[PDB]
Design a protein around this ligand. Structure first.
Ligand SMILES: *[C@@H](C)/C=N/c1c(NC[C@H](O)[C@H](O)[C@H](O)CO)[nH]c(=O)[nH]c1=O
Lengths: 98, 237, 263, 212
């Protein structure tokens, strides 16, 4: 039995428009540990992505963090694109400024 | 269970580890002395096959035999009286499991070493009449190295019940820097048991002296490691 | 006192993708990576600057050799499991071993094996047994319980050596592990009937209590909660919402200090 | 790191409670502390282990040993509630120094506190007998025995006579233990009546007549 990962997109600091900060994508709770994770700037992939190493959970699961440095503007749209074996197509989750 | 060795000053000494397992990966070595706290002298690393010592000791002071399949040995060089004490091997299984250890005494001069004389004194009839219990006294006199081990044997069997041995010897000459020692022990048994003439009592002092490796040049005998003894038989009166 | 934990994880995969290595093993102190060995490097390496500072060079070589041996054992075990289960393709095998020192004073010790993400064998150190989940698991259960010296060694390590390893690690990484960074608490307003947000930010110890109270009386639940996620700097963050003309107060407990905002 | 045992050497009874004081200063937040003992036979044994959150004792304690570990005062005390004569020994407390690998660690000990457990003589019968010598030796032996532990043995008045100190003799078969002290000399004016004149002797001490 396999489980789908959990996607969570947020910011390192309270996102103020026109202020350098970090965008974080936190993917946790997937049994098959083969994923593809990308960050999307205005519907286009970001290339200056940084990430920590893959880790283990006590429930035989994995978690990962993909983070980058950016400057938020209301015009720009930021999303996280993930592909997993349990997903028929790579799912995309957008970011809410709240 | 604790071995014992007496050596001259400036000579080497060998001590074997008495631990449940012969060969451990790391084997530590500690010294205990009467007045001060025990301290770790060193340990042996089997992987690097070397001794890790402490910062207060010279590197050319100790070394290891480390016979495979057998218990490890530690060798000490250029002995001095301040090296006298008791040396324990140690290992980490549950806690620091210390071994049986080996007591070591070393002397500057080998001229003043003597073996002890063992005498047995029979119980007084008054004590038998008064308490219905008999006390036999063993006195060992005239040994300079306080490295003796006293025991009692009834019918040729070592006894641990009803036996008391003095923990500190006493000096014949309290004003002498190098004075000889005397020690006393007591065995108490039921007076009926003593009055049985079949029962044989023996007081045995294992004296730790020199070895055949050492040479002797005196008119006297050679105070080698030996067993002195005295004995008595039951009196029914 | 704080709740600390030492863990070691081993992972193996059959017929992996070209990128994916066959065998990986890594240790974690309080969810911080400590060591790494893999089928590609074939060498054990640290993942913390204070690790190599205090350890001897012989340690890495010795545990690299032992990890090669453990790699071979893991491969043969996974192959046996696939043979028994009649499972083809790519499957996974996992092992976790470690101990925890809890804030209440109690201590634990665990050793579990899992296949395809489901628990397979759990070692009970007090009974010195192996609780299994299958007849296929029962076979290897009996096989391992045949050897009792190994079980004694496992219990001895889990009870007496894992704790010493964790304590010397916490003393080596005292700057990074025993530090504490207070959180930053903020209230946000904005939702047809907008809620009030209590937000904690930039705290290293990820254990926090987040509550709401009305005029000294705690709310009867009705508090929405959000996940506590880590910021990229090594700290953590969290948030909570509850909701008029009614007064409320946020309350937050962290690392032994209780804080009130009194909106 | 330093470990100090402020408690001096103490003599207790076979039914009292014994407290041993040990204070430690270490940089470690959760140090491993230990209580060990050296018996007169030089046996080095583990008594108790205490961290801040748990403790584990030796099998021979049988609930008679406990540890008072107070973090605020940095204190690690050892308490023996039913203390017996079998526990007379020199006790040491130690701490474990993390040095690389756990099996390479060192223990640092205190200078040591010595505990002497005197027995409880229910029916004291202080007596001074003269044990007749074997013809192998000429020395005369006077034995003072069956006295209470409260009586303390004083050394010889002169070097002409040699007097040992108190010793405890236990008959396990009859479960009876007594105290004993020997005195010997080769002087021509040596009598057991005058042997222990330098020590505080009980007024009811038996002085058997030589003409028995
Ligand atoms: C270097 C310290 C890596 N160790 C490591 C370990 N280490 C010790 C552990 O006790 C061992 O796994 C068990 O005794 C085996 O039964 N374990 C591990 O799983 N991965 C590692 O990288």
């Amino acid at each position: 039995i396999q489980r789908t990962p959990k996607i969570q997109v947020y910011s390192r600091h309270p996102a103020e428009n026109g202020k350098s900060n970090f965008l974080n994508c936190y993917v946790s709770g997937f049994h098959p540990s083969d994923i593809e994770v990308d960050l999307l700037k205005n519907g286009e992939r970001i290339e200056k992505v940084e990430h920590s190493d893959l880790s283990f959970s006590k429930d035989w699961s994995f978690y990962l963090l993909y983070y980058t440095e950016f400057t938020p503007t209301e015009k720009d749209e930021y999303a996280c694109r993930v592909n997993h074996v349990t997903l028929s197509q790579p799912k995309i989750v957008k970011w809410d400024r709240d | 269970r604790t071995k014992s060795v007496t050596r001259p000053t400036g000579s080497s000494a060998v001590i074997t580890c008495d631990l449940p397992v012969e060969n451990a990966v790391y084997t530590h070595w500690y010294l205990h002395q009467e007045g001060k706290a025990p301290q770790r002298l060193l340990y042996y690393d089997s992987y690097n096959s070397r001794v890790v010592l402490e910062s207060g000791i010279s590197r050319e002071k100790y070394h290891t035999y480390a016979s495979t399949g057998k218990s490890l040995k530690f060798i000490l060089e250029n002995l001095i009286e301040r090296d006298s004490g008791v040396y324990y091997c140690a290992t980490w299984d549950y806690k620091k499991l210390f071994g049986s250890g080996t007591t070591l005494v070393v002397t500057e001069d080998l001229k003043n070493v003597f073996p002890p004389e063992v005498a047995v004194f029979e119980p007084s009839e008054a004590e038998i009449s008064h308490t219905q219990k008999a006390t036999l006294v063993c006195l060992a006199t005239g040994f300079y190295p306080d490295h003796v081990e006293l025991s009692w044997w009834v019918n040729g069997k070592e006894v641990h019940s009803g036996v008391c041995t003095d923990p500190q010897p006493l000096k014949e000459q309290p004003a002498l820097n190098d004075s000889r020692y005397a020690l006393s022990s007591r065995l108490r048994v039921s007076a009926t048991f003593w009055q049985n003439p079949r029962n044989h009592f023996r007081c045995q002092v294992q004296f730790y002296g020199l070895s055949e490796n050492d040479e002797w040049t005196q008119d006297r005998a050679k105070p080698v490691t030996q067993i002195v003894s005295a004995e008595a038989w039951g009196r029914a009166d | 006192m704080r709740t600390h934990s030492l863990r070691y994880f081993r992972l193996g995969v059959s017929d992996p993708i070209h990128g994916v290595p066959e065998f990986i093993s890594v240790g974690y102190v309080d969810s911080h990576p400590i060591t790494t060995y893999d089928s590609v490097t074939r060498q054990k390496e640290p993942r913390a600057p204070w690790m190599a500072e205090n350890l001897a060079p012989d340690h890495w070589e010795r545990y690299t050799q032992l990890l090669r041996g453990w790699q071979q054992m893991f491969k043969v075990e996974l192959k046996r499991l696939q043979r028994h289960y009649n499972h083809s393709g790519s499957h996974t095998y996992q092992r976790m071993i470690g101990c925890e020192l809890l804030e209440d004073g109690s201590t634990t010790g665990f050793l579990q094996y899992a296949y395809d993400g489901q628990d397979f064998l759990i070692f009970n150190k007090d009974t010195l047994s192996w609780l299994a989940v299958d007849n296929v698991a029962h076979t290897i259960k009996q096989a391992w319980e045949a050897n009792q010296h190994e079980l004694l060694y496992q219990k001895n390590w889990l009870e007496e050596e894992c704790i010493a390893w964790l304590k010397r690690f916490l003393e080596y990484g005292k700057d990074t592990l025993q530090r504490t960074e207070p959180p930053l608490v903020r209230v946000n307003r904005k939702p047809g009937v907008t809620a009030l947000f209590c937000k904690a930010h930039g705290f290293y110890p990820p254990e926090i209590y987040m509550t709401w109270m009305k005029n000294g009386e705690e709310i009867v639940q009705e508090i929405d909660y959000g996940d506590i996620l880590p910021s990229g700097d090594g700290t953590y963050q969290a948030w909570a919402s509850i909701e008029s003309s009614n007064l409320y107060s946020c309350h937050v407990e962290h690392s032994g200090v209780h804080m009130v905002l009194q909106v | 790191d330093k470990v100090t045992q402020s408690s001096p050497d103490q003599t207790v009874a076979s039914g009292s409670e014994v407290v041993l004081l040990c204070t430690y200063d270490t940089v470690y937040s959760n140090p491993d502390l230990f209580w060990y003992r050296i018996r007169p036979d030089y046996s080095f044994q583990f008594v108790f282990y205490g961290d801040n959150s748990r403790s584990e004792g030796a099998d021979f304690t049988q609930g008679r040993f406990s540890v008072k570990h107070i973090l605020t005062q940095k204190a690690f005390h050892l308490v023996i509630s039913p203390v017996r004569t079998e526990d007379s020994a020199t006790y040491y407390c130690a701490t474990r120094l993390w040095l690389g690998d756990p099996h390479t660690d060192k223990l640092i000990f205190g200078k040591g506190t010595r505990v002497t457990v005197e027995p409880n003589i229910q029916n004291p019968d202080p007596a001074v007998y003269q044990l007749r010598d074997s013809k192998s030796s000429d020395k005369s032996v006077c034995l003072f025995t069956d006295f209470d532990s409260q009586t303390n043995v004083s050394q010889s008045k002169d070097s002409d006579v040699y007097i040992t100190d108190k010793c405890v003799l236990d008959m396990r078969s009859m479960d009876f233990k007594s105290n004993s002290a020997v005195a010997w000399s080769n002087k021509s004016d040596f009598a057991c009546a005058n042997a222990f004149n330098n020590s505080i002797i009980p007024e009811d001490t038996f002085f058997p007549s030589p003409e028995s």
